[PDB]
Amino acid sequence: EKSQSLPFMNRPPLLDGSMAGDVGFDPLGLSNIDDVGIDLYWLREAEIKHCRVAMLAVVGILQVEIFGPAPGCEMATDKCQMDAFWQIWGAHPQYIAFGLIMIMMIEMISGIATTQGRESGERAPGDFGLDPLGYGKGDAAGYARLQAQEIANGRLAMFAAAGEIMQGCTTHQGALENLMTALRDNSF
Amino acid sequence: KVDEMPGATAPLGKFDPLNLATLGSESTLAWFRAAELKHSRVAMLATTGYLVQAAGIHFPGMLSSDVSFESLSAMKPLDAWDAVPEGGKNQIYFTIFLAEFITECKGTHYTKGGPLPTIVFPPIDFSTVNPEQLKTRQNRELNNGRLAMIAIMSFVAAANIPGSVPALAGNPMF
Amino acid sequence: MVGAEGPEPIPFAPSKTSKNFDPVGFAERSPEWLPWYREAELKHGRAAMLATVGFVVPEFIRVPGEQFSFEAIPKVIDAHDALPESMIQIFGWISFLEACTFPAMAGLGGKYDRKPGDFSFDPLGLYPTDPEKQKQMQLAELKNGRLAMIAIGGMVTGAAVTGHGFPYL
Amino acid sequence: SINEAFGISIETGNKCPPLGARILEDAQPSAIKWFQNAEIKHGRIAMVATIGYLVQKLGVHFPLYLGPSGSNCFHPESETAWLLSSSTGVTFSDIAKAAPLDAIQMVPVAGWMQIFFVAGWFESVAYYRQWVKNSPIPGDYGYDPLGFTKREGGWDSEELTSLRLKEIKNGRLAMMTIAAWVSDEMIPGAL
Amino acid sequence: LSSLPGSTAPVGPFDPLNLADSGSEETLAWFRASELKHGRVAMLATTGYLVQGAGIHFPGMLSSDVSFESLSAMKPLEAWDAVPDAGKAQILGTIFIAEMITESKPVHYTKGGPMPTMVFPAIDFSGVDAATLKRKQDSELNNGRLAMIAIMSFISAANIPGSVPALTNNPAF
Amino acid sequence: MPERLWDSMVDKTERSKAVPFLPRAVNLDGSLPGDVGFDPFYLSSIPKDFSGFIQPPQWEEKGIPTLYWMREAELKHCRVAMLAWFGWLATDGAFGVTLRFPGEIYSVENIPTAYEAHNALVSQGSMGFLLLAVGFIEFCTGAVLVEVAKGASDREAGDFKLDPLSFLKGKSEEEIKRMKTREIANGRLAMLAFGGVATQTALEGGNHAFPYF
């Protein structure tokens, strides 16, 4: 049986289309890793966390570069968010350190939930029970569509958040005016 | 196939002293009949187009914005082609090309078991469906075209070498 | 095997005949080197035959380039040292042709059935079909090839001592 | 085997001349196939070489126009000079002015590279259809635009063996002819 | 083949190089849709050069600083250059949605499905009398075949003068 | 004095078809499309597993045939050089239009010939992005050679399933082999053709522009 994404390659044996974004795209065989505290559960939890962090980072850039910083943080004034971080750190550094320790407690608890959820079987990877509106209660076909839409928007936002870091740390302008610069440079 | 085709007349029955009909295949003879007929139809328009341009009759009144029809009626018709504008000769060479491109690409080519080239535009072709009357008519197209092939070679042997024909070369047009 | 007939007497040695001519005796001292010796004799023979034509033809006609002219190089004997960029391209493409014969040189014994000197090279088909004059066709290549091995030493030193044209003085 | 090949005929008494026979008694059937092919091909260029000399010793350069002032065989001068090479400036009228042997020296180096490339294509089709596809007819290069070779078929018919012998012989005439016509361009030896 | 639309009276089916059998049936179906899209683009391109080359232009302002007065003053092939960069971004964006929608039909035209139909406004054209749609598909392709020669002649006349004899002293070229 | 490796490399019964005085290599069978028996240095008969360059032999016991590795490398050399010789000439205006990207980094006033385009865009940064984009495809397509070396895959060499216009959908095996031979033959010519253009412009005689002589 061949991979859908790479039809010249065989299907990776631990990927069977059960997870949401599974089209058999593992050419390096990384889903077969089972040694240094890392397996398919750990990589799926890492993918989903990289999905959700990058999804929030993209709209977190596009909120400030369109509507400005939040009130109490009007000292930013820079569209480059890699530089606007250091103006908030320059004036109100305690709230960033408030969030970074609040993340530190959340992430250390999530690291226990990952390794206890792997040893047992009562936790899907990336699952925290955070469904307060309750989309997962009915229409399992429509709930698997939301599981696939999270992965599809999250895999796209991974490139976008990594790009906005890198083309913010190299052009020092901001994402949306990097976009206008590219539009006038490559117009035909 | 040379027995079953037109061109056989009463003075010379099947005139082929070099036996070039049976030299190749039937596609070689079908190329030869398509080349005798195409040389016939060009030379028939050539013999007519030399005589009605040596008679002085012409179209009114201006061929181009700079070149009149009457300025080409004064010179000989073999030198009138040198004074046709380059944009006009390109118009002629395009419609001749587009007729030769169509007749060799209309289906079931003449070198195969197909018909000889017909009228490109407009496509009617005026042919009699009676095979006893049509066979004589295309026997008439060939030897009228055979005589016109000798005739236009006599018109260029009178316009290049002075003399070479008794009933011409005394005429300021031929 | 094919080169040992005669009568062809040895000059400056009036008693010896060239039939089975081997005074040092390489055939009995080392018979396993004999297919290597025939391959080496033919390669010495075929290179010396083109060297003889190549030493007398640029005396009269030259290739139309103007660094090969008579005004550029009148003598053939200094053309090797005067056209260095012309020699590397001869040396480079022979080096390619010689490198494709190393697996044939590595199997010159009883490895595979290639006769020494046989490169399967007969595009014009001039090798005869009957076998008894194939041997004299092989003998003609050896006798003309041995002669050009002698002659190219006489041609070069005949032109190095006496700078002159073709025959010599 | 050479004295029972195709190209022998009545004009040497139905046997091949002995010095030309002497090179090919003890030779392979590929040897007589090679020399038959090189005879026809040398006859093939030499036949084109005559008409290429007849329009060069005359002034029948481009453009061709059988009327007067049209650079035909009767009146060989032109009025248009159709510009063989625009970047050089040379026309077809300049070629017909100098000489038969000066004509090839006005053609630019890129002009011969267009000719030698499609001749290089053609000699590759000629080698494939004759030697790789080992055709039993010497010189049969698969080129028959009008389909003469579909005659009976095939090659074992009177019309093609007569045409094969007429081709070699008219190439045999033109081989000495261009050698004699370029002789008078080189040296007075019209004996 | 002849049962396909584009085969017509003078040369039908016209394929001297036998390009229809160079691939499979899905290759020919890609060749048909590409001929149909090259035709529709060039018919808009031949007319867009003929209309803007005369002086027919919209009244008013194209943008805040570019009117239609200045773009009609130029020959059309460089009139695209003075269109604003937000103007080509609007044009290329709707073509991107148009190319994405006609590709994402449930059966691909390479696999026998429908060729690109209208996106906005999305008039249905299914049951429009297959005999009349057969003749009108031939006139779509034949007018496409002629306009592709026409726009290639207009660009060739605009840069190499005298390439076409009918457009030598034309001031739009 | 040991048994010579010469015997395991050559056929010793058959001759090479392209070089008739040499014996045929053991792996050259005439099954591959461009096969005319041409291997005078016997590089198809090298007993090394060359997929060790991608995943080492110490990782697990695997082995790819040398002819499979060489054809996969020949086809990649063919397809790169066909695009590269075309890409060198199209950005130099050899086909009339000097094809450039709409950006002014790639304009002819910034980069005059394709000879100067490598060093100008390593410094700018376009070549570094190409090495990321190519290296992503090479990590995702080069791992099938490990799958072939383990005996798990029946993939032919250079045989991704990339026929987007489906020229070989319903075709027979001798016309697929003809089409695979035309890829190999045009690829082998374009490899020598790229060798011509990259070297003739690199001489101190010059002519960085077309026709590069």
Ligand code: CLA
């Ligand atoms: C040049 C064009 C041309 C062509 C292609 C043909 C072809 C044919 N003719 Mg026609 N013919 C022609 C001109 C031509 N003819 C002219 C001008 C005359 C009047 C003299 C005739 C009188 C004639 C008669 C009475 C008959 C034919 C017949 C035929 C058919 C017999 C097969 C054959 O032998 O082919 C010929 C092969 C060719 C390659 C064409 C000949 C071209 C030669 C080889 C070039 C050299 C000629 C040479 C320069 C002399 C010309 C001098 C010039 C200055 C006047 C064939 C279809 C026969 C027929 O139709 O049977 C049903 C038949 O009975 N022809």
Ligand code: CLA
């Ligand atoms: C990757 C995510 C991310 C990061 C690192 C930042 C970082 C920043 N934002 Mg941005 N922002 C984000 C997403 C993000 N934002 C999103 C999703 C939006 C809405 C679209 C915004 C809208 C926004 C506005 C309007 C402004 C900022 C501003 C800022 C800067 C100061 C704010 C601060 O330090 O709060 C301190 C941190 C906290 C108060 C708490 C953080 C959240 C905690 C950790 C809960 C997280 C829960 C998690 C999301 C889900 C549950 C996890 C687990 C149970 C599974 C800082 C650099 C301000 C600025 O200065 O711009 C220059 C500003 O005006 N942000």
Ligand code: CLA
């Ligand atoms: C053999 C081919 C031929 C060629 C190359 C020429 C070339 C020329 N002709 Mg001539 N001409 C010809 C034959 C030819 N003619 C024939 C057959 C006739 C009788 C109709 C004429 C009657 C004619 C007149 C009255 C005039 C010219 C003129 C000219 C000159 C320029 C204008 C033009 O091309 O219109 C020429 C028009 C044609 C060639 C149309 C014939 C071709 C058609 C499209 C195909 C068949 C149509 C149809 C069946 C009816 C006519 C055929 C038949 C009844 C004769 C140019 C030198 C002009 C000139 O300057 O004279 C000195 C001019 O005033 N021609």
Ligand code: CLA
């Ligand atoms: C160079 C072109 C060429 C070639 C390859 C051949 C080849 C052949 N001819 Mg042909 N032949 C030729 C030209 C050629 N001939 C010419 C110009 C004539 C006079 C019309 C003939 C007349 C002729 C007849 C009557 C016969 C042949 C036959 C043959 C075949 C038997 C071998 C032989 O007799 O020739 C041997 C070929 C050579 C010796 C090639 C070398 C050519 C010269 C000697 C090289 C040296 C040239 C020198 C440096 C300078 C030029 C001087 C020169 C112009 C005098 C062979 C296929 C016989 C046949 O067809 O049997 C089937 C036969 O009966 N030939």
Ligand code: CLA
């Ligand atoms: C975008 C270009 C394009 C494409 C993809 C097609 C495709 C097709 N044509 Mg169409 N055609 C075109 C342009 C095109 N055509 C133009 C401009 C004309 C007017 C000359 C025609 C006239 C025409 C006719 C009369 C017929 C077709 C037919 C066909 C079908 C033939 C089967 C085939 O496989 O050919 C594949 C074709 C290609 C792959 C074309 C690609 C371009 C080639 C490879 C190079 C061309 C360069 C060219 C020499 C430059 C000239 C410049 C130009 C301005 C003159 C196929 C769907 C037949 C049909 O519709 O049957 C259903 C049919 O009867 N065509």
Ligand code: CLA
């Ligand atoms: C004088 C000429 C004239 C013509 C030819 C028409 C013809 C038409 N009008 Mg009428 N109309 C006229 C005068 C005319 N009208 C006048 C003078 C007024 C002002 C009083 C109107 C006001 C009017 C209204 C309010 C409506 C029409 C509609 C129609 C269409 C009815 C048939 C149909 O549904 O086809 C199918 C429709 C078409 C072929 C038109 C295609 C339109 C394209 C796709 C663009 C759509 C743009 C639109 C604003 C999009 C809005 C939604 C979008 C934002 C999501 C028909 C095309 C109706 C219509 O089009 O509904 C479907 C309609 O609702 N007309």
Ligand code: CLA
């Ligand atoms: C071997 C192939 C090859 C390579 C290495 C290059 C290299 C280059 N090109 Mg050229 N080019 C090529 C072929 C190639 N070209 C071809 C075939 C064309 C069409 C004729 C072009 C058309 C072209 C233009 C118009 C221009 C260049 C330019 C350049 C330079 C910068 C491009 C860049 O960095 O943007 C990055 C490029 C991309 C991101 C494109 C996507 C590349 C993909 C990811 C490569 C792999 C996909 C491959 C095609 C198929 C994968 C097969 C696999 C799945 C098995 C660079 C030297 C520019 C220049 O500076 O000229 C002086 C320029 O203006 N190229």
Ligand code: KC1
């Ligand atoms: C039906 C479409 C059509 C139009 C609209 C049209 C128009 C003009 N043609 Mg005509 N024409 C054909 C058709 C058409 N022509 C066809 C099918 C043929 C081949 C049978 C043909 C032959 C010639 C020749 C020999 C000459 C020629 C000319 C002109 C010129 C008038 C003077 C001018 O304004 O320049 C105008 C614009 C003369 C010329 O172009 O001189 C440079 C000229 O010498 N044409």
